[PDB]
Amino acid sequence: MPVAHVALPVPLPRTFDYLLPEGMTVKAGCRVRVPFGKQQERIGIVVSVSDASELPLNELKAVVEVLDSEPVFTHSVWRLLLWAADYYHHPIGDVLFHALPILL
Template identity: 40%
Template sequence: MEVVAPAEAASGCIARVALDVPQDRLFDYLASGVDADDIGRRVEVPFGRRRQIGVLLELAAASELPADSLKPLGAVDRRTPPLPAELLALARFAAEYYQHPLGAVLASLLPPALRRATAPRTQAVEAYALTEAGGLGIGELPARA
């Protein structure tokens, strides 16, 4: 995850984040260095005494809460693609229809490895390709091995 520095975040806009908690509302955080392209991305935010993974859903110019009570957005995961707008709309519909918190619905859309604050392990995959010289010999191979 890319870390947004708290000093940088103090002068930014408001990020509204859906968290997997039993409250059906979005949580406001100070954000800088984020834009509309980051909507649908996983973010790591301080929540109480711990850090939690949520999904950035909206950017706003102001919050109903006083600015000094807002915490800065911790990190934005730009290594993985954001959730598509269609999937976010489906999650909003399901949350409203089934009377379930939006953050919990969005968390159920994510694979378990992406629900945790620790970065998922990635492995380098070796790839092989047939060269032009190797392709010439394909016609000479027997039909049955």
């Protein structure tokens, strides 16, 4: 009863920022393993890579491992999926992960 769950009108990509460790590069389109909750891990997909972030670079967990060296998404498929997601109002994560099993 004390936790009100509010729904807000967030930007296009509602991605989650994670910090990359020392000497570990990843390109937009690769899958990565990251920390969620507290002591749980989950497979994610890199959407973008910038030097900035909505939150202080001091409180963003670091990626555990990059399960990819080369984007698992076609340069075309990728550009397409992102568009699709935005155009039809679908969560980027939703499209990406649902679209992966098929692409393979």
